[PDB]
Design a protein around this ligand. Sequence first.
Ligand SMILES: CN(Cc1cnc2nc(N)nc(N)c2n1)c1ccc(C(=O)N[C@@H](CCC(=O)O)C(=O)O)cc1
Lengths: 315, 280
Amino acid sequence: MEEAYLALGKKILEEGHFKEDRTGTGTYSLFGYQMRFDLAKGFPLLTTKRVPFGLIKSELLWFLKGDTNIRYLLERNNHIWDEWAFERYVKSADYQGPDMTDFGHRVLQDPAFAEQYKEEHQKFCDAILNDAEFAEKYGELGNIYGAQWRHWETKDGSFIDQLANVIEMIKTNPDSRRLIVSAWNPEDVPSMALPPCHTMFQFYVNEGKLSCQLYQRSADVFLGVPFNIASYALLTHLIAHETGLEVGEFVHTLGDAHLYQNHVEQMQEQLSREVRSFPTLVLNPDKASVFDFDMEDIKVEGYDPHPTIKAPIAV
Amino acid sequence: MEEAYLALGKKILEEGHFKEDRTGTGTYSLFGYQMRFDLAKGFPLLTTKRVPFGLIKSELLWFLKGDTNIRYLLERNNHIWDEWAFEHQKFCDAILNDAEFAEKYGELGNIYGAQWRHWETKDGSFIDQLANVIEMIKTNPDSRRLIVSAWNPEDVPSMALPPCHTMFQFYVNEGKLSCQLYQRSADVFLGVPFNIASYALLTHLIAHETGLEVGEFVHTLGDAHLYQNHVEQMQEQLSREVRSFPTLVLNPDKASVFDFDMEDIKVEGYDPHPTIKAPI
Ligand SMILES: CN(Cc1cnc2nc(N)nc(N)c2n1)c1ccc(C(=O)N[C@@H](CCC(=O)O)C(=O)O)cc1
């Protein structure tokens, strides 16, 4: 239930001790958490603030087609993966605009700098979208979620399609205890723009219902977790659709659940709002495979949330 | 709290879903569970039934030193894998006497020790996950990436018993080390008690190695299942009055944990109820 999520954010506000982090922003943090969402009770897209499903869709599709290049994402006007690509670009030999050291923090404090970042960011996206050589070198994120789900590279010159295998074990072996997809590949971690935040997931089956547990090593509570819940819920409806099954519980397990110190006013303002009905997910009955779904094949209807609460993304 | 485990077995008896596998094995089942153990309240060896700590020690020391060979376990009366290795005593004996014969037939290959200390790459090199996470702990305690993984999908479909312990994550706040463990499948009566002690000891060992106090051990389960002829044994356990967990005592005169042998790990104040027997 939404309440479960809202309770996480309260609990970190109350009890989460302060902890320095890679990004430099600062966080309040807990270790070890578990939220459950019965998906039969509604599609878990938060109603206490507007959460952009279109962006959740395209990021999922992007993960399922096995792709790790932002061009696809930018073609559908999704900029949620932009900064890590931009950061890679500005640290490269090829970049020659103004010094973008520390842009993640300096856009908040310095207005003529944010304008400069805004300019460079705009030429970066237009280069990715219109220069195939540039897209190819600088849209790339490494072997992040998509590469590991579809094309986990083997020792002897091949690849394992993890996701597709697990879908097929669900169909023929619904009681197996190894319905597991991992994105944590120790070989590829240092190559990755970021190691996987949602690290690994497991499926389970009882009386014709499909349930999923996610292990998430690092959980950005205000910005990310609303994405991840919806992302993994959508994935579960997709797999239940392909596999001919009803939809079960999504269980969200966390390692470091953190509230960025600059998300606190947002998380308090979110707590002051009454919970509304979850929406209903709608899928194309004509599509048969998880991997056949496109943007028009997935809608959410009945979504009537409270207003957008803006916050700054860490790094 | 030991009551977290006890509520878990009680919830399985009450709400667990029955299933029956190809061999004809019954189980009662739940998906998604989390138990926490505050290690400053005591070391979580079960008091409601006797749990054999020696076997947990020997087996954790064997994973920790990266050893995949039974000779170590055999020198310490631990027998839990001399089946996937096996006139019987002739073999056990020969492993224990002949210097070469142990290497020839006592190797077990790919399991926790090899995966924690020796994860093979494409170019033929090896990653020592555990060693690396220890230096990360000392040098970057605020890291959200203190992860060790036992799950390679290249090797799982090939292997005899794929790891029930799929990954663990460390965490540090205010001079205190915690560990969360994701376990994809769990024997609630015989395995889980065995696994709570193991991973709490691991946490204690890594805290000693890095000069930290112990925080929590968090146990997260996927498929948690009670075998149908553990029911009578689980019910018998829930009728017994919880006691205080005991105290772990680690030898303070050995600096590194990679030198710890059986004699250097002691449990004090351990007053469990009688051993409960069951099939495995
Ligand atoms: C890609 N992604 C997953 C991802 C990757 N690295 C991360 N790194 C950190 N520190 N925190 C995260 N949540 C995070 N998340 C993200 C990234 C940004 C937003 C985000 O800024 N969303 C805004 C803006 C949405 C919009 O474009 O309108 C929101 O209001 O929810 C969400 C998910």
